[PDB]
Assembly symmetry: C3
Homo-oligomer: 124 residues x 3
């Protein structure tokens, strides 16, 4: 057989402080293939929501792809995307209070596993 | 410590037209380790089912590993497989009508992330 | 844009015999990023539980991160971890009987996909 496959893959870590606002976490090239986005909450928040989505490089085209309330504290996107003009992974925390129930800062870590647009030919 | 790990990993994209029949999407070498198969439905189908599975290179040994009705529109296989004599990822659409509710062709994209059988030795 | 990404990724296979006790399966470097741990049960066990978790290199700090009863036979960890002083993936089988309902040895395979701590700079 013969096929075209993506041979280069990167993983990007970003961390934000679980504070109200928006954050630009992962930079993505055009044609990249996102196969994993995992959001992790380190700490014990009491009230808030974290929504991760795709935002354009400059124009404010944010659109949440995964929502995450307080209780589950972790979440992976259920769908795989191909990058086209939406080259920023962004996070939004619309509700956020202080450290919360512990006196320690609640943080969030987003890990993005994506394959580069470069393609090679393999025969099996 | 010391261990043997897979150092080479590929991602394969395939696209089909959500039409009745079968399609051979991803070619796999013997000993490859499939760690991800994600199926995505781009469009608004109204009636149908897509079943992805493993088929032998020539003999008709199709066996569905993931079923996908219309409503969820996306699905990832829940199990990881090691390739042995079943070297084709294949898709079957047994029910399929026209574009559907939009006038635009409904398509499906299958992304397969698999590690090559080549192994190196790493000490930590 | 500009960002720092992990460019090196490994996959490790380990196999154990579904027998009562503990097993040290995957060796992990400090700063490595675990993005996948999948546990697979090959065979037909009748009674038992398999708990996978992180154990320190020498000191007995086992802590299960995923539990797996008999019936589902497969499971992936729901959270991503960064390695720090907990550099062993370990499995524990606290209940285990003979081959079980088939006369053939029940085995378990754990696949660990993790990115190396090495980081490069990419501009998009």
């Amino acid at each position: 057989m013969k096929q075209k496959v993506h041979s280069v893959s990167y993983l990007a870590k970003a961390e934000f402080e679980y504070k109200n606002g928006v954050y630009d976490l992962v930079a993505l090239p055009t044609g990249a293939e996102v196969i994993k986005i995992s959001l992790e909450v380190v700490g014990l928040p009491t009230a808030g929501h974290v929504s991760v989505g795709f935002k354009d490089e400059s124009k404010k085209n944010y659109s949440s792809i995964l929502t995450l309330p307080v209780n589950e504290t972790s979440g992976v996107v259920t769908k795989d995307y191909t990058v086209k003009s939406d080259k920023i992974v962004a996070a939004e925390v619309k509700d956020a209070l202080a450290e919360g129930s512990d006196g320690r800062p609640v943080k969030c870590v987003l890990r993005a596993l994506y394959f580069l647009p470069s393609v090679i030919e393999v025969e099996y």
